[PDB]
Homo-oligomer: A and B are copies of this chain.
Amino acid sequence: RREQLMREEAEQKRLKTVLELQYVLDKLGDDEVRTDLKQGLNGVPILSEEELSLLDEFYKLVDPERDMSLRLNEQYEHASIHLWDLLEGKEKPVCGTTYKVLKEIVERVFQSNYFDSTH
């Protein structure tokens, strides 16, 4: 019953991580950001064209365009599952890779501290 409160804290931290991820993926639409990440801070890249492609492709899944076939409460089912699986870092296929690989990529982007500075 301290485990429930620990669960709540975990869920909140997960929400925070999701928000941060949404911010990053949103910024990955900028050509400056993309180049600056494709090059390093000194020719040791945080990202490669393949990884960045994987992120664009996952981005397609988690921020889908409104499909007129779906009700609003249906639109983000797969998105929610994609984000949750990403958080879990599972070895289940997605895009051209697994959620584990993607989670690692997101990890390197986060830990580069690129988004702590301004460029």
Interface of A toward B, CB cutoff 8 Å: 7-8, 11-16, 18-20, 23-24, 66, 68, 71-73, 75-77, 79-81, 83-84, 110, 113, 115-116, 118
Within 8 Å by CB of A118, from B16, B66, B73, lies B66
Q: Please, how many angstroms separate the alpha-carbon atoms of A115 and B76 in the complex?
A: 13
How many copies of this chain does the complex contain? 2
Task: Please name all residues of chain B whose beta carbon is closer than 8 Å to the beta carbon of A68 when the two chains form the complex.
Answer: 118
Task: Please name all residues of chain B whose beta carbon is closer than 8 Å to the beta carbon of A8 when the two chains form the complex.
Answer: 84
Q: Tell me which of A12, A19, A24, A110 has the highest count of chain B C-beta atoms within 10 A of its own C-beta.
A: A19
Contact B11 A11 (CB under 8 A): yes
Knowing A7-B7, A72-B110, the reply to whether A16 touches B77 (Cβ < 8 A) is yes
Contact B73 A15 (CB under 8 A): no
Contact B115 A16 (CB under 8 A): no
- Minimal Cβ-Cβ distance residue in B for A115: B72
Beyond A13-B80, A19-B75, 7 additional contacts (C-beta under 8 Å) are A12-B81, A16-B76, A16-B77, A19-B80, A20-B75, A23-B66, A73-B110
